[PDB]
Write a protein that binds this ligand. Structure first.
Ligand SMILES: Nc1ncnc2c1ncn2[C@@H]1O[C@H](COP(=O)(O)OP(=O)(O)O)[C@@H](O)[C@H]1O
Ligand SMILES: Nc1ncnc2c1ncn2[C@@H]1O[C@H](COP(=O)(O)OP(=O)(O)O)[C@@H](O)[C@H]1O
Ligand code: BEF
Ligand code: BEF
Ligand SMILES: [Mg+2]
Ligand SMILES: [Mg+2]
Lengths: 361, 271, 361
């Protein structure tokens, strides 16, 4: 009998193999602390192997033997560089975006904010501004442009119908979701579980792509979870709650030893609540990309409703050639002075005619 | 049970510090190797390294000894300084230390390492030509290219309740019982009376089953909560059964112990 | 066997010798309180001395003998004036700034904010405003203009890539860094260790610079660490946390007995949190150098994006000659009326022509 799951080590030194729901389940497979010690297994590690039905007085199946960890033979787990020990650098491997149903969005992103491997990015938009649809477009574009990259879609505290739509529209990439019907605790628990899985995969030199809707809602859950910290930050945020989300986001990085962790998440702003704005400003100093969407552009029904001037990456030179760098510089110089909505209109009209590279010519 | 000074030496080692190990303090100390007696670490140190006797040299005053010169107990290491025990007097930049040891100059590679304790015949340097014919620790001083085997041969150290519990576990009872049977049935009352006095507890343990290996305390259970009640008297004052007043202190005790064992080993402090 | 490090005196009167990582390390060397008492030695003092392998039951090697303290014989350590007893005065000796890859940045610094030895300085800019790049330029220009001075770079709560880029771009100068992945305790510990090392060096009449990226993040760590203090300052700042950064920055001073500590640090403003602004205004009264960078100038890609009008020193006369003082006074008079971006574009045009002395000519 074979079982599989993702390793979750308990405080007691033994662990369990989890399902896709990312929570304790009846059919989780017990993993003795021993196996963990011999194989140097770590939280989030994907474990597959033969198991046996639990003996009398046992409530969960026990892993008789381990076969493969993270889809590879266990021996390499004993000797491997730890994720924390991996050198963080810039993403030196740009990812071109193109999605058939709306490639305007992909080309505008490429002309506004290029993508690399190991990316620490963020999209910032008020409610109802294409942030969710934009994330869907990026997901579809990546699942057409970088199939090699493990695409995990994480949806925290968001609309269930959107979860169903993305699950159906993600063509099989791991969609992990925890709607707003869940308490903050479920959100956070799924958070560390997915995150550790990703870091364990990257430990093996893999490229992992994370598309996280509602990073701000995750920060809200962390704040609801921080037990006191004592004082409260400006706006009603907790001083120490944001440490965890910061660590989550800063985990994204490029590795000179192979593999990368690229996290792109959705941020909410102009909500009239100081929590959101403080969270955004806090995350901006940690992320390498901001991409801004304007509520007024959405009001006029112009998509993608991107605020071009505020949007951009850092170290575009490392993701684009000299020609593309100077072209984007020219395009921003031309567009720098224009009003948001009308600038986006001219950009769409100019990109609607043809593809971006031939738009250059 | 442990044939001990049950009253004095018991707490003496439990609270004051005394080295004890059974295997071999083979090297001499005025009396030959001791087998299970406890010692003060001052003499165990002086033994540890032969006999180093360091004496300052007045400034500008050159010593009357050489760097690798054998100096005997009582010899003047300098115009005013007088040695107190034999060995080789070594220079210090400034002073002279006569370390009780036998000297073996080397002109070839050294064969013993400063620190190793070598037996008579063991090679010190230069291969089989420079050999140690003295038990004890070795100092290979390239200062004059010699290997000095101090008489200080391998004698280790132990202390406190850990050594206590070790000896506990280090004892097999039926051996003691047979010996005590001899000590009563043959000998006269003066000694066999106490022999049987201990043999009685020996019988208690042996026939009782359970080992004394847990005779001492290492995992202290913690009273159930209400059993030492904390009752609210009024207005905020708390009336607590004194057990907690001690539990708290115990916790603090153990906590700082953990901290210092993680932080650093100030041996006086640690004790 | 020889060992070396910087002294960290424990509460117990004995100390340890540390490595560049500025943390408890397995290779640290024990130092008995006795030795400290003979050599009157102090925490942060650099100690070199022959050591021996630790005996049985010893976890750390023990320094058998002290050979050199702070690169000199221990004797002077017994007899020397004490750092806190050193007379604090103005920087009375200029440091000219010139770096080949961008002479314009050092140029505008010299024409706006010249740097003496013992300088208590600050550069104030929003995120993404040439602040860190500017600090890199100052580091390189120092390493070309003042190679004799012990150049120390400190990076707190900042981005790993910046760390590595400075390791390669500092050309071996002692840099101590602690990215944002580390907790504030690590940051505070490392900062105080380096602080004390620097004070010990200046105690021997030495010249030092601390290039501290993110002094505000260091203040953030101080706030997070200060246990209560009771009342909280407006903006979310703790009152007694800032005492430590205030002392830390105030350490920079000019010494009439030789040597001096200069500290140039990077400040964040216009970040949307009262906390950053309160820190800025609080440090501004202790520092002698404020150099302002404008976000709008960066948006136009005009560099260095310096806000000329807000920038300046205090006591230029002690650091500049009469001709240079009147040159810069004429310049500022010309320049008060112009707008930030226009002033910088025009200044870059005028300065791109010739050396600054030839610019005056
Ligand atoms: N590119 C687009 N094309 C058509 N409709 C869009 C687009 N972007 C946003 N919308 C509209 O905006 C609404 C919500 O935007 P979306 O990003 O999906 O969620 P959010 O409310 O988080 O922004 C949707 O009902 C959708 O009709
Ligand atoms: N003098 C300059 N030349 C070229 N690019 C610059 C210059 N100053 C700033 N930048 C741009 O600003 C970005 C980051 O600015 P930085 O100084 O790190 O932020 P901050 O000023 O807030 O510390 C870099 O990606 C860089 O391209
Ligand atoms: F309107 Be969005 F879903 F915040
Ligand atoms: F580099 Be900036 F502080 F975002
Ligand atoms: Mg949405
Ligand atoms: Mg910066």
């Amino acid at each position: 009998r074979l079982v599989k799951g993702y390793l979750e080590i308990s405080q007691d030194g033994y662990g369990f193999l989890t399902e896709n729901l990312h929570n304790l389940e009846s059919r989780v497979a017990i993993v003795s602390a021993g196996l963990i010690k011999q194989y140097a297994l770590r939280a989030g590690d994907y474990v597959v192997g033969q198991a046996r039905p639990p003996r009398e007085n046992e409530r969960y199946a026990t892993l008789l033997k381990v076969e493969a960890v993270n889809n590879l033979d266990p021996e390499a787990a004993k000797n491997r560089p730890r994720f924390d020990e991996l050198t963080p650098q810039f993403p030196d491997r740009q990812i071109r975006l193109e999605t058939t149903p709306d490639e305007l969005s992909t080309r505008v992103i490429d002309l506004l904010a290029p993508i690399g491997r190991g990316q620490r990015g963020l999209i910032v938009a008020p409610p109802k501004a294409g942030k969710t649809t934009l994330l869907k477009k990026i997901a579809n574009a990546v699942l057409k442009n970088e199939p090699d990259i493990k695409v995990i879609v994480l949806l925290i505290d968001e609309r269930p119908e959107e979860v169903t739509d993305f699950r159906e529209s993600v063509q099989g990439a791991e969609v992990i979701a925890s709607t707003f019907d869940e308490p903050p605790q479920n959100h956070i628990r799924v958070a560390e579980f997915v995150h550790e899985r990703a870091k364990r995969i990257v430990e093996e030199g893999g490229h992992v792509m994370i598309l996280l809707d509602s990073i701000t809602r995750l920060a809200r859950a962390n704040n609801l979870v921080t037990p006191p910290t004592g004082r409260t930050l400006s706006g009603g945020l907790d001083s120490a709650a944001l440490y965890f989300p910061k660590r989550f986001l800063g985990a994204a990085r490029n590795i000179r030893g192979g593999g990368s962790l690229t996290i792109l998440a959705t941020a909410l702003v102009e909500t009239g609540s100081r929590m959101d704005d403080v969270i955004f400003e806090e995350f901006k100093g940690t992320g390498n990309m901001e991409l801004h969407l304007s509520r007024r552009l959405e009001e006029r029904r112009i998509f993608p409703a991107i605020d071009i001037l505020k949007s951009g990456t850092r170290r575009e030179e490392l993701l684009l050639g000299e020609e593309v760098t100077h072209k984007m510089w020219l395009l921003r110089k031309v567009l720098a002075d224009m009003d948001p909505a009308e600038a986006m209109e001219m950009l769409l009209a100019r990109l609607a005619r043809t593809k971006n590279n031939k738009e250059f010519l | 049970l442990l044939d001990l000074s049950a009253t004095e030496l018991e707490q003496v080692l439990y609270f004051s510090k005394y080295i004890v190990l059974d295997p071999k303090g083979a090297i001499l100390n005025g009396v030959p190797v001791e087998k299970r007696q406890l010692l003060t670490d001052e003499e165990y140190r002086e033994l540890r390294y032969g006999k180093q006797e360091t004496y300052p040299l007045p400034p500008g005053v050159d010593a009357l000894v050489k760097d690798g010169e054998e100096v005997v107990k009582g010899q003047e290491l300098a115009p005013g300084v007088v040695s107190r025990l034999d060995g080789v007097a070594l220079y210090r930049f400034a002073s002279i230390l006569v370390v009780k040891a036998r000297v073996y100059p080397f002109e070839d590679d050294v064969e013993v390492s400063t620190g190793d304790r070598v037996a008579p015949g063991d090679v010190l340097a230069d291969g089989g030509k420079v050999k140690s014919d003295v038990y004890g620790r070795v100092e290979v001083d390239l200062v004059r290219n010699v290997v000095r085997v101090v008489e200080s041969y391998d004698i280790d150290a132990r202390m406190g309740a850990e050594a206590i519990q070790q000896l506990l576990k280090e004892l097999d009872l039926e051996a003691l019982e047979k010996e005590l049977l001899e000590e009563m049935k043959h000998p006269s009352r003066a000694r066999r009376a106490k022999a049987r006095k201990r043999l009685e507890v020996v019988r208690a343990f042996l026939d009782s089953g359970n080992r004394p290996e847990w005779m001492i305390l290492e995992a202290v259970p913690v009273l159930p909560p209400d059993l030492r009640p904390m009752v609210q008297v009024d207005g905020g004052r708390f009336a607590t059964s004194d057990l907690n007043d001690l539990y708290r202190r115990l916790i603090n005790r153990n906590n700082r112990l953990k901290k210092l064992l993680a932080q650093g080993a100030p041996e006086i402090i640690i004790r």
